[model samples]
Structure formats: structure tokens, C-alpha cells
Target: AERISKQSTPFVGAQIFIEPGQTQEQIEQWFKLLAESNMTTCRIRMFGKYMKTPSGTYDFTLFDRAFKLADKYHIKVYATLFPDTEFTDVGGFKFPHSREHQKEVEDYIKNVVSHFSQYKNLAAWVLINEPGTPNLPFNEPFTKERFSDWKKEHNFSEYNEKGYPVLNFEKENFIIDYHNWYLNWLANQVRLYDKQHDLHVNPHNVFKLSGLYDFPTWRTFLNSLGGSAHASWHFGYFPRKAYTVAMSANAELIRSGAGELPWLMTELQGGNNLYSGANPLCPTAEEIIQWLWINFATEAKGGIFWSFNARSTAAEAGEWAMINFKNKSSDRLIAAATIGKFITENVKMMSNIKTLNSGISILYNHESMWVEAAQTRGKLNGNGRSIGAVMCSPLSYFEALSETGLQANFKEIKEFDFSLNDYTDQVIILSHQIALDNKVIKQLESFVEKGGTLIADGLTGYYDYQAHSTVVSGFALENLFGSYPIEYKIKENLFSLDFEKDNYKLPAHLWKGTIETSKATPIMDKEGECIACINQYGKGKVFWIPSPIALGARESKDFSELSKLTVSLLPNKILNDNPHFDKHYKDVMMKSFKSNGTMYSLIINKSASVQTVDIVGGKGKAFILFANKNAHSTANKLTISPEETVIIKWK
Candidate 1:
């Protein structure tokens, strides 16, 4: 009866591939290494593509041995029941529509679940591995059948092989709806036969399905939340900003998506990968350690590397491994094991405390993204800052907060409960939120009316849910903010918007909005065009920025100054109540979490040059709890070297 969420004990481990290629000795070594290193739990893929035989019966040859070895090593196994490892379709729809294939998948999940239910080592079940798909065909017979069935309740012309229902906004909803059903149906398949193991999904945010799954409702079918963030898959292009968006913010998104459930960093990057997505890259041991500690501070139930051993055959062969081609522990594995030993041993002190709060809430509008996709006739743009205006801008806001020693969480339009006191100090950011329905507009109005702080950027609500363009855009909140964009368009080159009140010139490009402030007070703009504004509404205030300024901070090397404006509007509670690190370290990363009524500060000097910073305010009586460089500390000051991390405890 013990669920993952209610369990206060934290854990750490890696994902192991139980392939036909791996020998029994190799499997034994994998589990033995985990057990010896105190990395107690490991995730395994119950690859249906590999197990399904010609007779249509499933084979359990490899998994049976894997579970036995895991139990012997006292390791917990959470199986990813059906990975589309090599299969073209899931639940047998092959086309995602055949009722017969759907039923077959149901029986297939039951087969795996009942077969593995007898094992004491199997702790949980992941419904799907990063549930999503790339853009593909819809003319399969099974798909046509689904299309016919879908038309029963909803009114639509056809499946749109020629891109039907283009102007009506039905195309986006159809596919996204299918993805939602596919995701939930897969979850239901697992739950149909097994009620014993805790259920979850490793939703890959970089995939096409990032905007499809209904996250608020997605938590209803699971016990804990998780996401996959390999360095190559999610953050290869920006290694400097990887820790900010890839690991820490990714985990926060899972937490937000999960609601009250416990969460995990399910698939962190373990080693180099040639074809993990954007580029071939390998994160260092130091980088791996950064991911672990950052996830640890999120109060995650565990942190599991993407892999334990590198694959010997297949698309990912000889890559993405904590253990190398020869099965020896790499430096990345060594770093992971070293941290695992500490966290697993010190679970008692870490389990009950919440990580420090940044009081910053950024909005990720999948609906807006969907509308954007419809405009382009369905394309999968990965969630990188350079991807598109809609996808890039929100993460920019997150980038602004994260690098400033403040944690930011992603939220949707529906999740805001303005009546709750929790939102009183929360800063809700709408960065490039182009599509906004009247309902969401009112919902945001309620948020600010309840004394919440609202920060909006660029073309807010230019498009409705139907993808209809508004006559006047730029956050379209004239009554609430007394401002609307009279003119806005995409520019070919980047330029700086010089602030009227100060020398703080922000980088702006691609898109720009010219604010027409009627009642709202203009803050600054180049030559008085009013690029930014501040307006008092109800019990709250709205800071309207008519530029995609965050893109600068996200894309540039020197972004600290670009981020200061957004950070200035954050809750004073976050600013005044938390421990402060000095402003000197340009290559600095800091996080605060409390344990047993004591505040613990995790600081890393990420540069090659050594630096020292002062421990100022928020708490009294400090001691060095953990450090890598024998970092010097004298009551009020702590000096750290290049490439080192230090933790300080204060009461």
C-alpha cells in the first residue's frame, strides 16, 4: 500500500537496458555495481518491439533474468512497459486507430504486468517511454477508421490528408486530441491488469507531444511525476544554460504538471550520444553532478541516469552510458555513484524539506503553441529558445529567473487559483503568449485582482483559441493594464531598446510590440515609443513589456544585466527571506533547501577562474556542510575555487 508520493525516503540510480546482447554476467555486474554503489533503483524498458514473437505471443526471456538479478542485488525495478523502441505504433494501432490493435495492446500490457507482478523487486511501472510521436501519415486504414469514428460526435469535414479544416482551427485539436487519448489509453492499459505498482510517465518535453498531454489531468492516472532530459536531447546547443533549463527547470515543470505528487529526474544524460537528437555530445562528471544536486534540491524522489551501460547495437550504440563499451564505470558514472552514496545515506535529513522558493511562476501555453503549429500546418518544433517565438520566449523568462539564484516553475492558464493566498506573492509571467481566449484573459484578471504580480511580454492574445487574429494585440488587456499594442511586427535584425529612465538597454529582435499606453504609465522606450509599462490594477500590478527582451538573456553569453529587470519585480519575500550570495561570481549557481529546520545553501563556481563570495542575510549561525575544494569560510564569507561546489548550513 506504500505509494511513491507518500514515501519520504529519497533514492538514486540509473536506467539499465536488458537486451538479448547483454550476457548474464553483464546483467549481474550491472546490478552488483548499483547495489555496491548504493544506487538502489534502476528503470528497465520492457521492449515490446523485441519481445513480441512471430506467433504473436510475448517473450519474457530477458526481463525474467533482469528482475531476478535486481532482486538479488536488493535493487528496485521500475519497468517502462512498452517502449516504441523499434515499433512504428503503440497499443497496436500501428496507425493509432484500429480497435482490434488497441485491444491487443491492452492484452499485451496485462501479459507483461501479470508476468512481472510476482517479482518483489518490481516497484513501479512507467506507462510509456516519453509518450509522443514525430509528424507522420494519417491515411492508414486503421487511421481512416478512427477518423470516421471521431466524426460521430465532433463536426469535421475529414481527416485532412490534404490538410482539411485548415481555417476552422480543427486540425490542431484533432491530432493533439488523438495524442491525449493515446497517452491516457496507454495508462489505462497498464492500470487494467495491475493495481499494485505505482504508475507514471516519462513525458519528454522536447518531443511533439509536449503540448498535447493535459498535464493537470495527466496526474490523475499516476502516483508520481517524471520527465526525460538528456543533455543532447534537450540541452546540447546551450551547454552553459543546460543546468538552468534542462535539469532544474525540467524537474520543476514535472512538479508543476504533477500537482501534489512526488517527482523524479527519470532520464538524465549519462554519457555521450551520437544520435540522441540535435547533436552528439557528452556531459562531464562535473556537469552530471550539477544535474544530480539540482534535482536533489527539487525534493525529487530520485535521480536516474538515462543509462547504466552503453548500447552495443542499434541507433544509440556505443554511446549514452555511465559504463563504457567495455562495461567499466566511466567518470560520469563515478560522479553519479559518489553523489548517490551521499544522498542515499543522508535521506533522513533531506526527505521532509522543501527546496527554497523563488516566488517566480512562468506560464507555458501549449494552447498557444498548438495555434502556432496550425498556422504552419503541423510541425514539431522542439522546445529550444531559438525554435520559434512561442516556444523560445517562456524558457527565456525561466532563464532570467534561474541564473539569478531564483527557482521558477511552469504553469498553465487553468492552474491559477487566484483566491489562494499562495499566489499573493507569486509573479506570473506570460512571455510571448500570442493566443489567449476570453476565458483565460478573465482568469488572469482574477489572478491580478487577488493581489498577484503579472509580467507580460510581447504579443499576448493576438490569436484566440480558434487561431483568429485580434485587431489589437500585445497582451490585449486595456482594461486591466490600460495598454494595447497598436503596431507590432517581425523584424529582420536585432536591436537594443534604450531605457529612458536609465542606461539599461535590452537586446530585442525577431518580434517587437509598440505599446499605446492610455492609462498605464510608460516606463521606457527608444525615443518615447513606450517599450515597457507598469499599471496598478485591483489589489495587484501588471508590468507590461512590449518586447521579447528575454530572448537576449536566453541567447547571449552576457545575460546577467538583461535579466535584472524581471528579477526586480519578484516577491520581496523571496528576495528578503532567503540567504543571499554575493553578486561577484559571473559563473555562479546557487540553490537553497531546508532540512530539519536548518537552511542548506548549495553553491557552485562554474567558471575556470577561482572566486570568493559573501554569505549575506536570511539566516544566522552557519557551518560548512559539504564542499569539494575545502572552500574557505569565515562566518560571513565563503571562498570557492574554479569548478567546485560548496554547501553551507545555516540556522
Candidate 2:
């Protein structure tokens, strides 16, 4: 797999899905504007209609013109393969609408990649777009035949007149098998024609990708791990910068999923999509820049805006346009350009950036999510929102850590190496991770025995890998938690939490399960029950929280006040307290890391009013890199606007 890189930095671009009817001048203007804004790439769909003629041959007149302008403006063409085809979906493989259509795809890729390879401005080949957006059409004859083949080998209930469930394992197995096969084939097919360019795919719907994506396999096939982090849709749009925090969590997923390969924000939302019911409003210029900085703190190679120009025709017409309808630059474009120019121009500052490695990780297991998806019959366990409740817990922990001035990465259950303690992240948190197998349990037991910490809350070890349940929760780790969770219950409103380690109390938590045991000391028995407790295991310790503490703060109205409870429970070794603030530091979040013998801090103000705080941990005066117009630059006295994020560089 090859990564996309040029001039020792990352590519910054925006989507420009060109049509034939648009003028040559229009194409040039789009490229010119991107160049003027210091963007080095423009993503284009290789439309079948434009290239494939009625005579069944191929033409490249329009493509040639666009590539010429891209070369002229020094903007590389990020060519996306096969948008207007039956094969675009993540698992929408009918084996090519029968064999003839398979030939159509083969011919399609050969012509498209070969023609594009001739252009000096070709950047990378995006094999597919938005792979997480499922277009599962399996009723077709060929897909049914393929399903029959899968059924032949595996043992599951066969066709019945009673009709099958939507989320049945039969369909899921087929999807997983075929989607993986097609992607491997498609990636290789593109290489067969283009030979040298990097291969990329930007998957979206990050929260739901659990149980659907195969990241380790993807890492082997891809040059870079990239995703569409359109804050509103990808992460549920929430107030007080919750979506931003969710975006950071999503970035952690991509970062770890990418392994050693550089990851990227392949599509950052530029404008609003009118079709969205959750959050249709446009992102402010400040929000746009904040997302790019999110990429920075996460060490993403780069980011690309969703659309530079609005669609003049189609369902999302006039939507997601970073420029005005009249094709003039807007604030979103200006903000995007600012980060694009600065990142591409700044070499040493942007060179070899990595996270500070806080030795903490929020573990998300796909097996649990798969159980939820199967039980919910493909609702993905939405409960009441677009994303499932399963993600809320882990995402909340991630955000709370960020708000508490610590960085955390994400570790998939499959990614963790239990054999030799190969992984380095010292703390693993299971936030409502309901499913666990014997292997995972043994490794976790080993992890704790080897001086590692395991923090868990709500329903962990409640279900086995195949959705079977243990009589009492916590499975074999009843000893680690001091007792099995005797009963499960839910509470919606505010309640007080009594911590064993700290005197602080939180107002609300959702899951208030009952735990009965004496082996572990009760942490919150002031309420006359053991809902929370702690136990020492070998060289490490396990904290058992019976309530969903993280999700409560995530969904609660009093987030700033409530999130402190989760932070209070964390081990002191994993906590990084910022000392230069008073009470107003509630909504402020900071992430600091070292790169190239320099320290950098990314601070974001999620409150409505401005905030000023002193910097005590830095080497000296902070040199601000990206900030709002009103932000003050002094290292000691830094003022940040509402919802604004500032970057500080120090020795």
C-alpha cells in the first residue's frame, strides 16, 4: 500500500464533482480558487456518462481540460472511482449485476485509471466514497444466488415462507464476505491500471462503523486511513461542542485503525446539508478551523473539505457549498483556506507530529455492537437517536478526558494484543462494552495482573461474543470487581454519586445496577448499597462503576458539572490537571504533545463567553498558530473566543 504525500507535508483539498455542462472557465475558476487558497488538490468523480460514449468507447476531452487546469494551478486531482454505478455501496456487491456488468466495471476501471494516470496532476485514487453508508440491496437474483452459495457452506436456517429477519446472521455474513472481496479486488484492479498512485477510501458514519468495517484488513490494503468527519452527520450533532469531542473520538478510531499508516480527515463538512434533520445549520468559520485543528491534535496527515462548490443540479443542489451559489468565496472557504495554507507552508511545525501517549484508551468492541445490531434487527440499536447508545459511553469517556486535559486513543478489541502485552497503552476502559469472550477475559486478567488498570462501567461482561449472557454480569471477573452485578436497572434523572476515592458527587447517571459483595470495598455505599466499588487484582486494580457515568455527562444538560465524576474516578497516573485556571475552566479543553523538540498545545473554548487563562506548563511565551481574530497571543494571558480553538507553540 502506498501513502499520498508530497513536499514533506499532507494534501489539502476540497471536493469538486465536475459535470460536462459546466464551462471550461468554471473548471479553471474552481482550480484557481483552490490554488489561491493554497489548497493543493481537488477531488473529482470520474463520471461514467462523461467518459463512456454511446458508441461504447471512451473519451477524455472534458477530463483532459480539467486536468490541464489542475496542472496549471498546481492542484492535484483526487480522482474518485465509480460514483454513478451499482458497485459504489460498501457492501452493495451483486457480483457486478451479472457477469456482463462485471466486464463493464473492469473496462470502466481500466479506462478511468489509465487515462487519469497520464495527468501530471493526479493525486490519489479513492476506490470508494462513504463506504459506511449502506445501500444494501440483496433481493436481486444474483445477490440471492451469492447468498445461496454462502448458505451452502455455513450452517444457518434456510429460506422459509415465514420471511427472515433483517439483521439475521445469514445476510450479515454474506455482506462481510462480499464487501471484503470486492474491495481487495477493486484496490488491486486500480493498481493494475495506474501502477504508482496511492489508494484511499473515506468511510463515514463513524459511530455505526462498529460491526460493519474490517479495519485491520483495510490497513493492509490501504495507503492511509481516511474518513468523512462531517461533524453533524458522522457524530450526532450536539450542543456545547459535544459533536467536536465526538469527532475527536472518531479520529482516534481512525488513528488506531490506520496502524502505522498516516490517517486523514478525508471530508470535513464545509457547508450545511439541507436534508439533515439533526443539524442542518452551517458550521461557523470558527467551527471549520476547529475541526482542522482536531486533525492536528490527532496527528492526521491532512483534511479535505466536503464540497468547494455547491451542486447546481441533483438532490443536494445548492447544499454543502463552501463558496456562495454565485461561486464566490465564503467564510467557510476562507477559514478552510487559512488552515490549508498554514499547514502546507509550515514544515517543521507540522513535521512528524504524534500524540503525547497518555497511556489510556477507551476500548470499543465490535462484537458487542454486533450483538446490538442483531438484536435491534439492523436499527443499529439507535434507541432514540441516529447513533446507538453503545457509543455514547465510550465517546463520553474520551471527551471527559479531553476536557480534563488528557489525551486518549481508541483500541478495538481485535487490535489489542493479549499474547505478550504487545500494546503499550497502560489503562483500558470498558464503557458499557457488554460483550466479552474467554480470550478477551483471560487477556484482561493478564493485563491487570501485569500492573495495568481496567476501569469499567455498566453492563460490561453481560453478554458473551455470540450474544449469550452469563447468569450474573462481570462473567469470570466477579473476583476482580469483588462481586457480580446482581441486578440491572436504569434511572433517568439526577442522583448523587458517592466515590470511595474522592468527596465529589455527580448529579446524574443512567444505569444504576445493583452489586452485592463483600470481597471488594464499596465505593458508593452512602446511598446504602454497593452500586460502585473497587478491588485490587495482583499488581493492578479494577474500579467497578454500576452506573453509566460517562454517557450521563454526554447527554446531560449539566455536562461541565457532571463530567468531573468520571474524571475523579480515573487513576492519578492517567490524569493531567491544568493548574492555571479557576472555575471558568469548565468548558475549556486542552491537548498538549511534543514534536521536533517543541511543545504544542491545542486549546478549545466550548463556552458561550470568552475565557482567559494563564499558561504555567509551557516552556515560555506561546506563539499562536491558528486562532480567531479576537484571541490574545501572550503565553501567560491567552484569551479565546466562544467556540474557538487556539494552537500554541512553545519550546
Candidate 3:
């Protein structure tokens, strides 16, 4: 592996797929265009149409030509090696787990690395793009025999009453483990042949809002293989700000998972997704720049567009391309070039800056999301809404925090270290889902016991780590939350919640469990029965709401009153009390982070109308990093235009 650097230059580029009929001149032209735009990297897929001859022999002609062009143009190449399920027929290997397939894959890896190891332009090797996808195509006869042998070898046994293998969590765990083990084996092969290149795997759908992955386990897997991390998102037509927030949270999770090794956004939506039937509405130039800056602000080292040229043959053909098949640049490419220039000019300052230590940490549990999906059975409710819709509850909470001007970072339950002093002054919000592991319950107990504040929603801690129902229905911390659920009700349509001081209508999809608040103080109640309450734990306080408040607030937009009430319970030091900008535009979003002895604040206006936000807490003159416009400041205020983003620096 190349010596991991703290100051690795942030990479910005696009995916370049070589088609069957593409010419060397066309490939070189694409490389030249990328070099002109100040892009530092380009990802190339090495299977299907590029390599893998019809006779099952490996061909390195296209890759060799592409590598030479990349070297000539000064653009690094991120080589993706294995095909996903969709391309399994045309690709060389059958399945990763089978011994016959494993040998073929290892040989392929060895040959590819040996041929390309001489090129300095080869930046990284992607082992498998979207590994562990549910839709892997397998050669049935071989797989069945191999799986049976593997099960016996590992002494694995899970059978039902009728003498059939039980295949719920057991099968899922096997698939996950198989994927990890195969990935580790592939990485070892790459290391044996090419010890200089950084190994990576771009995992898609790992953090799907509607799905779950044991992120901590995956993190451990990546660390063991000395691999870097990459995450992709194809959220269809979701608000750009919300998507950016979700991607920010994902980047942090991967950063922690990869042992703080360099991580990047390997695939973001650059064009329409034909597969999802999403409209052809591409993100505007402003949206593109905002995404670039948002990733940087979250400490992601780099980002690459899904593809440089749009495809025209496959299912996702003609969609998600930065450059058209005719070699014409789209507005997205122009925007990327602009952002690339900015990064090229400020690479040193931008890559070295880290996120500030002070911010609310949102705790999310993938197991809980899985339990929620299982409870819903992947079906829609009587109201005709999919149960998977509730999976975005965490994102809704993120939106609520953003709307309230609170800088937040997401922490997976298993990765969270409650003993750290980093979160002493910040309130930790755990929303959505009911399952909890004993270890997490103890951590929360310790967090509150040490004077750290916690705010949790209704369903939390109602189930144990194994997704089994707990004795006390509402939470594992029955005494801390000071309430135990007695009865539960689910509505078919919608319901209205009446708080102590406010009333709002919300979706009826979720369940409401009656709380017996014998030791807690009620903050909000429905019909004299407590729905929200607070209990004073050892040194701190535990605020509990027995509903999906974040989801309700996001859908209704009228839950700001409830959000404000929740925010009021936090310590004053944890709140940003500046009135100069908070009261201005409803569409403006702002977040501040201190890094390298400098306070960096990001202000983005999602509104169409011009917004003039007043700065309140900075001393001395502040410099705007990208925009050439001067800030209209009067000691404590600055103004920004619509769709504009400003990164301010203050000592």
C-alpha cells in the first residue's frame, strides 16, 4: 500500500467506461478533457466490454491503452475490478464463495495487478463494486454443493421444526460473512501482486434508508484488509440539502469504519437514473457546487461522478453521464470543472481542515432499522404508504436539526464511544426504532450518569439487541426513562397529537404505546396519558418522546413548535442563540465547524429569493473562500444571495 498520507490531495473526477466500439482517440480525448478541468482522478471498470474475452481469457489491451492515456494526461486512475450481478453473465467469475470461482478470481486479480502495477497513474484498486448486493447471480449447481460443504466445514446449523434449514438471520449473516471473507481474500491477492496501490471497495446501498448493514462489522472488515472506503447514493429526487446531509453522515460513518483512512464519495447522481424511472431532471449547476462543498465540509477527502460518458445500450444507459456519448459537455460537467478549479486552488487548506468537535451527535442503529423493516414485512400500510417510508425517520431528524441551525454528526450505535469527552456538552438524539442491545443501554446509562444529556424517541429500547421484545415495553432504561409501556395502539389512517401546549396532525402508520410515567416528568401528553416525558438520571436528564417525532415534524412541517420545545430542554451552551440570521429566511441553512484553529462556517440558501443573514458570533474580519463578492457586514451581520454558498473563515 502507498504510504497513507494525512495530506493526500482531494480527488475530483468521473467514471469512464470503455464500450465495445470505443476508439483510442475517443478515450484520449476524454482524458484530455478531464485534465483540462483540473480533475485529479478517473475510475475505470476493468470487466465486461473492457476485459474478459469471449473464451474466458483476460485481455489487458483496453486497460493498457487507458492507463497510458491517463499517464499522458496526468489523471490518476481508480481501477474497478469485479462485476456486479447485472454483468455476471459477461464477466469472468461465477460467484465469489465457490472454490472454482475463487481460484479464477484470484488468477484474474494476480494477472491484472501484475500487468498494471508498473503504471504510476494507477491510484487505487476497487475489489468489487457493490459487494454483497442481494441480487448476485450464481451458478446454482456449483453454489449449492459449495454452500453445503462450507456450512459443514464451519459447523453451521439452523433448522426449523420440520427439519428444514431456517433461513432468516442465519442466512443473512452467512451471506454477509461470505462477502467479507471473499473481499479479504481478494485484497490479499492484490497485495501479493501489487503492494503499492491503495485497495478500495465501493459499497452501494449499504446505508439505504430502508435497509440495514452491521456498519461496525463492515468497518472491522475494511480495517482488517487495510482498505479505504467509498459510499454511493442514488436517492431519487430527494431534496438536495437533505441528500447532502445524509451523504455527510455516511461519509463520517465510513471514515470511522476505515480506521480514519481516506474516504470519498465514489458515486453520486450526476444525471437521470433510468432504472428507478426517476424524471430526467438533473441537478443544476448550483446544486452540483453545493454537493461538492458539503462533502468537503463533512471531511470526505474526494468525490467522483458516476460516469464520464453516458451509456446507450444497457438498462441504466443514456442516464448518469457527465459527458454525452457525442462528446458534448453537460451543465453538470461545467459545474464540476468550476468546483475542480476551486479545489485545485485551495487543496492545501481544504484537505487539512477537520470538522469541529462541538455538535449534536445523532445515534442510529442499523439493527433497529432491520427490525423496523421486519415488523412492516416490506408491505404498505392500510393508508397505502410503504412501511419502508418510516426508514427515513433518522434523515427526518437530521433535517429537523438542520432547520433548527444545529450542526449534527451521525454515530452508529456500535461505533459510538460514550466515554469520550467529545460529546460532553452536546445533546445526543436517538430517534426511531425500538430495539436496543444491552451494551448500548449501558452506554446511554453511563452518558446520562455522567451529566451528558440524551433525547430519545418512543420506540427506542422496547426490543433487545436480538430484536426480541423486552420485559419493559418502552425502553431498556425503564428507570432512566422513568416509564414502562402498558398498552399499544396502531391506527389505519392518520391521527392528531395534542401536546401540553400545541396540537398537530400526524400520520397514523406508527404505533403508540401508553406510558406509565411514574418516575418521569411529562413534557407532552395525549388525553392525560404521557406521550413525552423527562426523567432525571444520575447527573443528567433523559427526555423521552413515545413517537416518531422527527418523522412527524418533517412531514407536517408544523412540528417546529414541538422541535422548539425539544430544543429548549438542551443546555444553553449547546445552542446557537444568534438572532441576527436565525429569524431571516426559512430556506437558508447554516453550520459552523472549527478546524486548524480557524472557525469555518457554511451558509447555503436553498431559497429562490435573496437572503441576507447577519453574522453574530465571529470576531475580526472573515474571509469568504470561493466567492469573489464582498460580504456586506456591519460588525455582526453578513449578506448572501439566493442559491449561493459561502465558506467563511474566522480566527
Candidate 4:
């Protein structure tokens, strides 16, 4: 989701759900609470089976009341259809397979679509809950149209004692095929039913580590099943750095030639883990806010809280629910409202802004990721590096880039012809043990020869299509970047080093590269190698940092310092000017946008302290405005902290 700013204000919101047995009055109270708390959207789930008739007919009484109240308050409603309890199809929520049952499911969706199709407050409809078929039997009515008693004649207890059929069963394929078919059919059904309704329709799927290998086929099937215009994908997982990389790669994959659309992180867990064995159950109120902002920083259009009301049973899990039945607001509710308002106010200003311009284009290759997972020697030995780690690993080095106010977009080289035509910006090519095509190599050479910036990390330029190391005599990127054919094995358990210090004074014994005394300057050195350097090419510049900095290690302090130096070295082609505040957090990023004759600079502070900043070139005309109020207008200087952000404008 994009952050929009208006006269210097932030937007915020949270997810609210309507339980199955709630009365009409109770439902109205829920909507009232949301509106009273400044929330703009509520994603209410359709009732489970118990609330419906045994014949699969939906009462729609509760939903009708819910939507009525939402409409009364002009609050947007996202109707979530969670079928087959547990989403695994294993629990009691499973509906018996019958023609009537299928009709009920189809009709239910169409009815909901038609009913709210004309309501302006209806935001979207989630077709189904997270769907995945695990070890459950695939031979039943759910998997096939018919299962005869005769088919049970075969006892595979010897060949496959696991009770499941042999690997690659016809039934298994049928189940997979049917799941895809149903998902597409359901999504299309909603689209067809609500032709005039402009609300977005997204059906979320559960994400497993194994899901990536299957995503390409699933994505293609979904797109082919239904055009990408009205359909999108959703992911659910623990909130962490890995979540950012995974989402980035998936977004790139889906957007690159698949379709141009927005990716939604619909089901983000606001509190800590909801499952048992975790203390306080939910993440701290403060931590939840941090996670929410991080998701925005990554490029999520919007997020839906996992749940609203607490669970009926007192299980150790489900503690992160937004509110208890007694109506006491959890800290999460407060955080959600604050974050949602932030989005409503500032999304427009941040939306549509270009991300990933200068640093290397980290190719997020699922093929390489899967292959590396299958390998025995996946760890980097000695000074060796893995591009997968650089792209998807949980290390905090990339966070260094985020702290400095930059973004990295993951892309597949195969999706586009390796040409810089569309991307005039410089690209750093991070390797994932995947070979670059001849066309790609040619583009890299041209990029360097034309004075385009280029940088490649360790083990890059080391392999070809057959997994054989590339010969130094014929390698493509070495000469262009002025690097030699260096070979080094992984240092056993330690594939790379996390330098212990943040600033390098240049050890007296370490060998240093001599400065060529040119447009670029040599910044850092280690072991006689040029670890970090920068050179100007044409109207742009290139930076090279060979060593992979360990994330979160004390050594990362130096990497953080280096990132600051790098940003200072290459001024972003697009700049935001602010006359109000002189500086933003060194880690928080600021970008400039200009319209008509006016310029507005967005200052986002990601750090934990109030910071003093210097706007070196703003001509001393910046002023700080809070929630559309000119709280502090300065002709000289300003300071902001506590992770707060603002938009400074010169009108």
C-alpha cells in the first residue's frame, strides 16, 4: 500500500470482525466501535457452518445487520468467506461433497456479491480461507467425483505404509487440479457476479516454505484461470525480515510480465505469536507498531488483522485477538487504529513512487533458492557467498539500506530482456549461483563501457548453466568492474565474516588499493582488496561492496556507517527538499517529489530518538506541520524523533 500525505498528516486503521452468534445490536456496537476509534475499514468474516442451515443455506441475517451498520457509518467492509474450518479441510467444518453442497458454496458467494455490489462502503470480498491439502486422504469425494468400494481392494501397506498412495498418484494430481480449478472458479464467480462493483477481489493462500517451488505453476494457473486485472495473491507468515524478501520476490514475479497489479499483505499478525508456549502471547504494543510500519515500508497496499474478537475457548493461542468478548480493547486495537490512520492520510504521497534505483538488482530466483535448499554444501565456505542469502536471508545488512531510506526490488532476469532501456538507473547484479544468459552479460558489459555503475558480490561470475565454474579467460563481468579472477573456498562453518567494528581506520598492516585520483574515491579497504569503492559513470555513479556484511552482528555497525557514506556519495537523481527540518534519521529515508512549482520532501524517521537534521540545500524555507497543522515552521532548523515522519513543503 502507498502512504499518502496531506498538509503533513498520517493515516491509520485496524481490522474488525463480526462473530457467528452476535446479535444485530451487538454487530451495530462493533461497527460503532470501529467508527468511534477512527478506523475506516473492517474485514468481517462470513459465518461458519453452525450459523448456516444443514442444507447449506446461509441466514445472512447477521451479515445484513453488520453491513447495515457499516453503511450507516460509511465504513468500508471487506467480507471474508472462510470455508472448511481450519483451512486444512481436516477439521469438522468440512462440508460433505455433494452437487447440492457445491451449489450452496457457489450461490453463497454470488448472493453476497449481489447484495453488497451496489453499496459504496463495500471494499472487497475474500473468497476463501487459507487453503492447503496436507497428509489427508486424497481418494475421497473431496478429491474425486466418485470413490467406489472396489477401489479400496488394493492394500498398499507394503509399498507405501504411510496409508497414502504412492508418489505421483492420479488421485493426488486430481486433488491439486481441483483445488486450482475451484479457486479460479470462485474468484471468477465473484468477478462475474459483481461486474458493476469496483471493489478489489483477492483470494488469499497459505504460504509454506515448500510453497515457493510450487508458486510459479500456481501463479500461472491462477492468471490463466482468471486475468490478473481483478485478482491478486495474499501471504501469511511470521513477521520478520524474511517476510520482506519473500513478499518482494513474489511481487516481482507476479508483476513481471504476469500482470501489473497491487500485492496485498492481507493477514499480517499484529501481536506476537498467537499459538501456545509464547509469553504475553502477542507482540508488545510498541513492537506491533514497528512491524506495521515495516510492512508499509516494504510495499504492502493494506493489511488485515488476523482476527477481531478473542477465541471462545481459553486456549493458550488466539490471545492477539483485537478485543475480548467483554469489549476491553487490547493494546493491538489502539496500534491498529493509529497505523490505519497513518495510511489513510499519507498513502497517496508515497504510492507510485519508484523503488530500487541505485544498488544492485538483487535477482530473487526461486529456482536457485530451491536448488540450494537441496544441496549438501549450501553454506558459504571461507570467503564464499551465496546470492540467495543476500536476497532472502534474514541478515540485517539490507536493513541498513532501509534505514538510509532506500528500497530494493527483487526481479527475475528472465522476465525481461537484459537491457537498461526501461531502467536508466544503475543496477548491481547479485548472483544466486544462477548463470546469466549471453544477452544479460552483453548488457552488463555495455552498462560498464557506457560508464554505467555495476557491482557483483562473492561467488558471482563463478558458474555457468551446467554448474561448472566459469573460466577466468571467458568470464563477463571481471574486466568491466576492474576485478581480478579471485578464488576462495568457504571458511567451513563461517562462510562470511561479520566485521566486529563499525568504522574502519584502515589497519596499518592491511593492504590498500591505491587511489587512481579520478572522479570516484576509494572509501574502505581490507586484506589488500578493494572491499568498497565508488566511481562516476556518465550522469550516474556505481558503488562496489564485495564482502557480505553479517546482519545484526556488532560488525553491522560498520556496514551501517558504510551505507551512510554510500548515500552521501551518490545523490539520488530524484530529491525531496524540506525547509522545516534540517535532517532525518541517518537510517530513515527521505525522498523528494515536485508538482507544479512546489516541492515536498517526505521525512520518515525509523529510529527511536528525536533527531537533529540539516537540510543542506533547502534555502532555509522548511516548516514542520503535524496532522495538517503548522506546529513548527522554521526559517533556519528543526529536529524530529520517536520514529515520527512528516512531509515538508515549499508552496
> TM-score winner among the candidates?
1
Q: Report backbone clashes per prediction.
A: 1, 0, 3, 44
- On residues 271-375, what C-alpha lDDT tens digit does candidate 3 reach at each position? 655563333456666766777777667666677887787655766677777876677677878888888888778766776767654446777775676566567
What TM-score fits each model? 0.90, 0.89, 0.86, 0.65
Clashing pairs in 3: 311-318, 458-546, 615-637
How many clashing pairs does model 4 include? 44
Question: What would the per-residue lDDT of candidate 1 be over residues 66-143, giving only the tens digit for each residue?
Answer: 999998988998888663334433222223445665666677788898788778888888877776555433766665
Report the C-alpha lDDT of model 4 over 249-328, residue by residue, as the tens digit: 34333333233334444554544344533122454454445444443433444555655554444452344456655665
lDDT of 4 at 114: 68
Model 2 C-alpha lDDT per residue in residues 518-631, reported as the tens digit of each score: 677775546666677777777777787767666656556455553455455555655433222322255677767666767777888887788786655335567787677557
Q: Arrange candidates by lDDT, descending.
A: 1, 2, 3, 4
Alpha-carbon runs more than 4 Å astray in model 2: 1-7, 86-97, 154-170, 275-278, 376-387, 417-425, 472-474, 493-504, 507-510, 560-563, 569-571, 576-585, 613-621, 633-637
Relative to the true structure, candidate 4 reaches a TM of 0.65
Better of 1 and 4 by TM-score: 1
Error of 4 at 465 (Å): 6.7
**Which of candidates 2 and 3 reaches a greater TM-score?**
2
**For residue 298, what is the lDDT in candidate 2?**
80
